[PDB]
Amino acid sequence: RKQVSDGVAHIHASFNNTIVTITDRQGNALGWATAGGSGFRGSRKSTPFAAQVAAERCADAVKEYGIKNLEVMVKGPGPGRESTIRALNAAGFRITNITDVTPIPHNGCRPPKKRRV
RNA sequence: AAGCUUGAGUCUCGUAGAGGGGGGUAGAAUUCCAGGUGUAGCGGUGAAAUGCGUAGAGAUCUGGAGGAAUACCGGUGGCGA
């Protein structure tokens, strides 16, 4: 109801999907979008554009909270970790900080091995 | 039968290391329990379904624990048969 100018975004991009959540630095979420929830499937569900449209759908949030100043905390290897920021920083918001927060085992317990075809 | 020493070794004073054994306890990440903010998806893939989803998931912030495995330093750098 009142304009507070400030927020923080949490972005995760994988080889199958991309997630974009808008929060306040008090940890409190205000809205979220995904590349799967954008209506995308298969090898296309992770794409830079399926994530770009998810960022445009998320950039409609927080209008009544009047947020413009933005920090971004990024995760995952997926191509969606770039187009999402570019589009959100064009949709009225201004970036001040981008930091990678990918949680990593350093190092244990046995190396991953999956899907051989 | 008896000398000699080069063979082998030890001692004085020093050199180096993820060698082994006994007993402590600490740096994080899967994951799950519990609450705030929050909403309809998440997971897989050439596609998917079982499965997890309003019984409020995933995302975020926080509180917490068992147990396995221990980044950087770390290298033409080392130890053990």
- Structural tokens at position A31: 């809205």
Q: Taking Cα atoms as reference points, which of A20, A8, A30, A38 lies closest to residue A82?
A: A20
Joined together, the tokens standing for residue A101 give 């927060």
Task: Work out whether strand A67-75 and strand A29-34 pair parallel, antiparallel, or are unpaired.
Answer: unpaired
The DSSP call for residue A99 is E
The stretches of chain A forming alpha helices (DSSP H) are: 48-58, 80-88
CA distance A89 to A102: 21
How many C-beta atoms surround the C-beta of residue A85 within 10 A?
Answer: 21
Q: Which nucleotide comes closest to A21 if you measure CA to C1'?
A: B59
Residue type, A116: R
With CA of A23 and C1' of each nucleotide, the nearest comes out as B60
CA dihedral A102, A115, A34, A71 (to 10 degrees): 10
From the list A89, A57, A58, the residue with the least C-alpha distance to A72 is A89
Do A29 and A61 touch, CB atoms closer than 8 A?
no
